[PDB]
Every structure is written in C-alpha cells, then in structure tokens.
Amino acid sequence: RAIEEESFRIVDQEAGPHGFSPLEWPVVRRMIHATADFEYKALTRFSQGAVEAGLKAIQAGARILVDARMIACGLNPERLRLFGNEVVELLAHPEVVARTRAEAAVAYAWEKGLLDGAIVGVGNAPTFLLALVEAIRQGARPALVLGMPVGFVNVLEAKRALMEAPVPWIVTEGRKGGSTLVVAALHALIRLAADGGV
Amino acid sequence: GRAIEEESFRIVDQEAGPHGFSPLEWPVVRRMIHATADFEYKALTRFSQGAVEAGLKAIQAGARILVDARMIACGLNPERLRLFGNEVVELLAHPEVVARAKATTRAEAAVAYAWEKGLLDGAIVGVGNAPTFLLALVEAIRQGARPALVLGMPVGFVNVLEAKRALMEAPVPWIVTEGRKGGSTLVVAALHALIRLAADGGVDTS
Ligand SMILES: [Cl-]
C-alpha cells in the first residue's frame, strides 16, 4: 500500500538536519525507514558519485553480487526485473562451496570477471570485503561497493580499507550495518534508476 | 570461523552492562544485539512469562516457524533448522495467500490461510515486517488460535506501536522489541538463539 509513502513522510519530517544530495538522501531515508534507526543519517557515508555509479550500473543491467542469502531473497524480484539485474549469492554457490568460504567466493569471482562493473553488497562478511579491497588493488573494478558489514571483529578495518579503495562506495560507519541495510539501499537505487533520478 | 562468532558474543557481553534479563532470556537479547551492533535492544526487548521455555519446547517438538517475510525464511540457517527439523513457512509471499489476496489485505489472507490450514496451533510465529499481519493474527488469537510463541518485532512508523501492544496484552507467550525498532534480522537472531538454547537443552553454553 501507500504505507510506504506515509512512512517516508514521517521519516523526512522526523529526520531532522540532513545534508545529502537530492540523489543520495533517498538512499539514507530508505535505510532509516528499514531500521527505525535515525543514527544512519550520521553513519551513512558516500564517495564521490556513488549513486550515479549505482543508477548507471542498475540501468546498464548490472549484476548484484551479495554476501548473504538474506540479501538475495530480500531483493523484491518485481523490482529486479525492471532492468533485469542478476543477483549472485556467492558464498552459497556450489562451486565456491565445493572448495574461509569468503575468499573462495572472490576467487570464483575474479575467475570470471564478475567483479568488474558489478554492484557488490556486503552486509555480513568483513573478511569478504577484504578479499575485495585487495582484489581492487589487483585491478578488479566494480561499479559500486556497498560496504555495510555489521559486526565486532574485522568490521572497522574492512570499512576503513574500502573507504580507501579506488572505487565508488556507500558505507555504514562503525559496527552497524547488515543485510537489511544492504537491501534497503538497493531497493532505493532501483527505485531511482527507474524514476530517472528524481 | 566459529571462534570469531564466540569472540563476538564475548564482546557483546562485555559492553552490555546491567540488564534485567533472566538466564534463558539473555542469550536471546545478546544474539539480537550481536546481529545489529545496536545496544538499545537491551532496553527495548521484553519477554512474556514463560516465553523462552515455550519456544524451546516448540523447537524440540518440531514446531513449524511461520514468518512474514522471505528475508526471515532465507536468513535462517539450514544446518540449524535441521537440528529439530523445524519447517519454515513464509505466509505473505505464499502462492495461495497471494492468490486469495488478489481475488478479494495480503496479511489477512495469510492468517486466514494459516488458520484454516491448521498451522497456527503449536507454531512459532515470526513477524519483523508486517504490523497489519500481527494485528490480524492477534484478532485470530482471540478466536481460538494458539501459536506456541509469537515474536512481535515489526519495524516501522505505521501501525507498529499498536500492533505490539495488541500482542503484549494477548493470551500467548511472546517476545517483543518495544518501539519502532525491529526487523527480519531481529527475528532471525532470536530464532537462532532459541534453537541453540534448545540444542543445548536450555543451558547457555555460550
Ligand atoms: Cl545502556
């Protein structure tokens, strides 16, 4: 229903003082909306041209590689079809499996040029985000990297690292983040990429 | 890999602080905080008398888990569902439910469907997304539905606060995240905590 609409109304109205470009506020709003946690207004950091990078990748029909099944099933298929984007839950792939399982996903990824131009969503595996910031140091170039691992170990470094990598990103500073934030930010990107950017 | 999780649980116990939870309730709250790195859940999480024990018992009975979102269904760990083989049923996205829905609230079809099919009795219900679902279910409870346990953790700004109140004054055990906070991740974490406690026969080995 329109509950979605009124919920966003309450979010903006209640958001308070926020400084985000017309294109990136919609991302933060959705994240706040999905968690009832206004602290994301302060924690969510974007790099230069993060959204455009996302909108283009999405429109370009890009592939969404995610680090958790919760993220895959969370992506509303009725939204993925619009630009027909392929979601790839690596860690659960039979090949990756057959062979930590986080590094096996990246390898299997650097072994097919998937990392290039793809939107990467990380909401759980900090180590995985490290097998990427290094893989980025080795040439791999994804369109956008959603660095939102939630956790207590390896999360600050993994994000610090990503905010230092030469690729577009959106991070949730600190220990906070998770599958819900990744999903929320993706649904927001697919929504704009379908609304022309308004 | 396993060590990291144990380590991470340690860290949450270290930074939790004074809390008013029981020995069986704590492992649940800890897991929810671990899953979100959000310490406010120590203060927002409320249990009903006998909720946890009601949960372990159902888990061990092989009780079904009915949820209001696919993220919850997929978020659950297959290896953990395997311990006591607890079938998971995603109602809101269910075929028949969506079918009935279109015909004539998809949240109403869900409960009505679940009830008619005899799925609510003995079941553990996980709500982290649809408030109107928790309201329908609560009304359905006043008509004779007896779920083993209900996790009322919808997140949001519309119908959320009242949906939880309607649950916290009902005749069924429950666990709620007070306020507007909650979500799929909280239900999954709470369920995983229940399964682990059950597997360990009610003893917090973590
Ligand atoms: Cl506190």
Coordinates of C-alpha atoms in Angstrom, one line a residue, chain B residues 32-205:
Chain B
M32 CA 19.8 -9.7 18.8
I33 CA 22.4 -7.1 19.7
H34 CA 25.2 -9.1 18.1
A35 CA 23.1 -9.2 14.9
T36 CA 22.6 -5.4 14.9
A37 CA 25.5 -4.0 16.8
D38 CA 22.7 -2.0 18.4
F39 CA 22.8 -2.0 22.1
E40 CA 19.4 -0.3 22.6
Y41 CA 17.9 -3.8 22.3
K42 CA 19.0 -4.5 25.8
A43 CA 16.4 -1.9 26.9
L44 CA 13.8 -2.5 24.2
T45 CA 13.5 -6.2 24.4
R46 CA 10.7 -7.5 26.5
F47 CA 9.6 -11.1 27.2
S48 CA 6.3 -12.6 28.5
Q49 CA 6.3 -15.1 31.3
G50 CA 7.5 -18.5 30.1
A51 CA 8.2 -17.2 26.5
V52 CA 11.7 -18.7 26.1
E53 CA 10.7 -22.1 27.6
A54 CA 7.6 -22.1 25.4
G55 CA 10.0 -21.5 22.5
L56 CA 12.5 -24.3 23.3
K57 CA 9.6 -26.8 23.8
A58 CA 8.1 -25.9 20.4
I59 CA 11.5 -26.0 18.8
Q60 CA 12.1 -29.5 20.2
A61 CA 8.5 -30.6 19.3
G62 CA 9.4 -30.0 15.7
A63 CA 7.1 -27.0 15.6
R64 CA 6.7 -25.1 12.4
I65 CA 8.0 -21.5 12.0
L66 CA 5.6 -19.1 10.2
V67 CA 7.2 -15.9 9.1
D68 CA 6.0 -12.6 7.5
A69 CA 9.0 -12.1 5.1
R70 CA 11.3 -14.1 2.8
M71 CA 14.4 -12.4 4.3
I72 CA 13.5 -14.2 7.6
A73 CA 12.9 -17.5 5.8
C74 CA 16.2 -17.3 3.9
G75 CA 18.0 -15.6 6.8
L76 CA 17.5 -18.8 8.8
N77 CA 20.4 -21.3 8.8
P78 CA 19.6 -24.6 7.1
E79 CA 22.0 -26.5 9.4
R80 CA 20.2 -25.1 12.4
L81 CA 16.8 -25.8 11.1
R82 CA 18.0 -29.4 10.7
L83 CA 18.6 -29.9 14.4
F84 CA 15.0 -30.4 15.3
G85 CA 13.7 -30.1 11.7
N86 CA 11.5 -27.0 12.1
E87 CA 9.7 -26.4 8.9
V88 CA 9.6 -22.8 7.8
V89 CA 6.6 -21.3 6.1
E90 CA 6.6 -17.8 4.5
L91 CA 3.0 -16.7 4.5
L92 CA 2.8 -13.2 3.0
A93 CA 4.6 -14.3 -0.2
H94 CA 2.8 -17.7 -0.2
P95 CA 1.1 -18.7 -3.5
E96 CA -2.3 -19.5 -2.2
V97 CA -2.2 -16.5 0.1
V98 CA -1.3 -14.1 -2.6
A99 CA -3.9 -15.8 -4.8
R100 CA -6.6 -15.3 -2.3
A101 CA -5.3 -11.8 -1.7
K102 CA -5.7 -10.7 -5.3
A103 CA -9.1 -12.3 -5.6
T104 CA -11.0 -10.4 -2.9
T105 CA -5.1 -7.3 2.7
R106 CA -2.5 -10.0 1.9
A107 CA -1.9 -10.1 5.7
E108 CA -5.4 -11.2 6.3
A109 CA -5.2 -13.9 3.6
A110 CA -2.0 -15.1 5.3
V111 CA -3.5 -15.7 8.8
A112 CA -6.9 -16.9 7.4
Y113 CA -5.0 -19.3 5.2
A114 CA -2.6 -20.4 8.0
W115 CA -5.5 -20.8 10.5
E116 CA -7.8 -22.7 8.1
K117 CA -4.9 -25.0 7.2
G118 CA -4.2 -25.6 10.9
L119 CA -0.8 -24.1 11.1
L120 CA -1.1 -21.6 13.9
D121 CA -1.6 -24.0 16.7
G122 CA 1.8 -25.2 18.1
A123 CA 3.6 -22.8 15.8
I124 CA 6.3 -20.2 16.4
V125 CA 5.3 -17.0 14.6
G126 CA 8.0 -14.5 13.4
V127 CA 6.9 -11.0 12.5
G128 CA 9.6 -8.5 11.5
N129 CA 7.8 -6.6 8.7
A130 CA 4.0 -6.6 8.6
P131 CA 2.2 -4.9 11.5
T132 CA -1.2 -5.5 10.0
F133 CA -0.2 -9.1 10.0
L134 CA 0.4 -9.1 13.7
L135 CA -2.9 -7.3 14.2
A136 CA -4.8 -9.9 12.1
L137 CA -3.0 -12.7 14.0
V138 CA -3.8 -11.1 17.4
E139 CA -7.5 -10.9 16.5
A140 CA -7.3 -14.5 15.2
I141 CA -5.8 -15.4 18.6
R142 CA -9.0 -14.1 20.3
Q143 CA -11.0 -16.6 18.2
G144 CA -9.1 -19.7 19.3
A145 CA -5.8 -19.7 17.6
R146 CA -3.0 -20.9 19.9
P147 CA 0.6 -20.4 18.5
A148 CA 3.3 -21.8 20.7
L149 CA 5.1 -18.5 20.6
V150 CA 4.9 -15.1 18.8
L151 CA 7.9 -12.9 18.1
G152 CA 6.4 -9.4 17.6
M153 CA 9.3 -7.4 16.0
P154 CA 7.8 -5.4 13.1
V155 CA 9.9 -2.3 12.3
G156 CA 8.3 1.0 11.1
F157 CA 6.2 4.0 11.6
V158 CA 2.7 2.8 10.6
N159 CA 0.7 0.5 12.9
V160 CA 3.9 -0.7 14.6
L161 CA 3.4 0.5 18.1
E162 CA -0.3 -0.6 18.3
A163 CA 0.5 -4.0 16.7
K164 CA 2.9 -4.7 19.5
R165 CA 0.5 -3.5 22.2
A166 CA -2.2 -5.8 20.8
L167 CA 0.4 -8.6 21.2
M168 CA 1.7 -7.7 24.7
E169 CA -1.8 -7.9 26.2
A170 CA -2.7 -11.2 24.5
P171 CA -3.1 -14.8 25.8
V172 CA 0.0 -16.3 24.1
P173 CA 3.7 -16.2 25.1
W174 CA 5.7 -13.6 23.2
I175 CA 8.9 -11.6 22.7
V176 CA 8.7 -8.1 21.6
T177 CA 11.1 -5.2 20.6
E178 CA 9.5 -2.2 22.2
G179 CA 9.0 0.9 19.9
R180 CA 9.5 1.3 16.2
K181 CA 12.6 -0.8 16.0
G182 CA 12.7 -4.5 15.0
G183 CA 13.0 -6.2 11.6
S184 CA 13.8 -9.5 9.9
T185 CA 17.3 -9.6 11.3
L186 CA 16.0 -9.4 14.9
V187 CA 13.5 -12.3 14.3
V188 CA 16.2 -14.5 12.7
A189 CA 18.7 -13.8 15.5
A190 CA 16.1 -14.5 18.2
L191 CA 15.1 -17.8 16.4
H192 CA 18.7 -18.8 16.1
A193 CA 19.2 -18.1 19.8
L194 CA 16.2 -20.2 20.6
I195 CA 17.4 -23.1 18.5
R196 CA 20.9 -23.0 20.1
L197 CA 19.5 -22.9 23.6
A198 CA 17.2 -25.9 22.7
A199 CA 20.1 -27.8 21.2
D200 CA 22.0 -27.2 24.4
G201 CA 19.0 -28.4 26.4
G202 CA 18.3 -25.0 27.9
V203 CA 21.8 -24.3 29.0
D204 CA 23.6 -21.1 28.0
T205 CA 26.9 -22.7 27.0

